[PDB]
């Protein structure tokens, strides 16, 4: 099982299919009832979806080395209060900041990191940035008003690829076959050992240690 992001709006064509909108996050189930379809669930509804309408899920809120200016840019456009992201300073490497939208402005918090490697905003110290974010999904980040962090509306990205290091003939069913050198579209890398991908018109599981990254360029 896996989550993916919708690249297009899909209106269901029969009653056993699942409608969705671009950018929705879909829970896809391991199986594929058709060669071109998955069964999937979304917002309390279940049905089939087409393989070629979904993309690997982007990270929901870690946004790398983007500047404070650009973060205000993308958070201004979000419809919902609490929309947030975390960014590294390209100035001070390794230091992080938290940008959140509330009303017609954008607040910036500095994430602190103590002698033990613990992160914090105020007093409570967290083992990781994930623990900070999830804490503040239900306790406000602001000391004046209730700001609860909410994932921004997500947009599907350009696809991520790997490249085969070795030939891989599939033994088991539902495994993806390829040849050394082949470029593989990656659909799910959430698991440390077995990833879901596509090549030569097929989809399936393959072992990550048979492939090497293809670094982004567009």
């Amino acid at each position: 099982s896996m989550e993916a992001i919708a690249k297009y709006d899909f209106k269901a064509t029969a009653d056993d299919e699942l409608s969705f909108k671009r950018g929705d996050i879909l829970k896809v189930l391991n199986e594929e009832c058709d060669q071109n379809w998955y069964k999937a669930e979304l917002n309390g509804k279940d049905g089939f979806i087409p393989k070629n309408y979904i993309e690997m899920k982007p990270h929901p809120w870690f946004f790398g080395k983007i500047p404070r200016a650009k973060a205000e840019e993308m958070l201004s456009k979000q419809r919902h209060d609490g929309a947030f992201l975390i960014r590294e300073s390209e100035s001070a490497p390794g230091d992080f900041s938290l940008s959140v939208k509330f009303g017609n402005d954008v607040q910036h918090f500095k994430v602190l990191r103590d002698g033990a490697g613990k992160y914090f905003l105020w007093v409570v110290k967290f083992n990781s940035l994930n623990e900070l974010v999830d804490y503040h999904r239900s306790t406000s980040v602001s000391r004046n008003q209730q700001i609860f962090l909410r994932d921004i509306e997500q947009v599907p990205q350009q696809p991520t690829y790997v490249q085969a290091l070795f030939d891989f003939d599939p033994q088991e069913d539902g495994e993806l076959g390829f040849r050394r050198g082949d470029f593989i579209h990656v659909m799910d890398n959430s698991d440390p050992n077995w990833w879901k991908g596509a090549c030569h018109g097929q989809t399936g599981m393959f072992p990550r240690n048979y492939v090497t990254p293809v670094n982004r360029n567009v």
């Binding site: 900041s97 910036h108 918090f109 500095k110």
Partner: peptide
């Protein structure tokens, strides 16, 4: 800026 100086 920062909301926790």
């Amino acid at each position: 800026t920062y909301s926790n100086l």
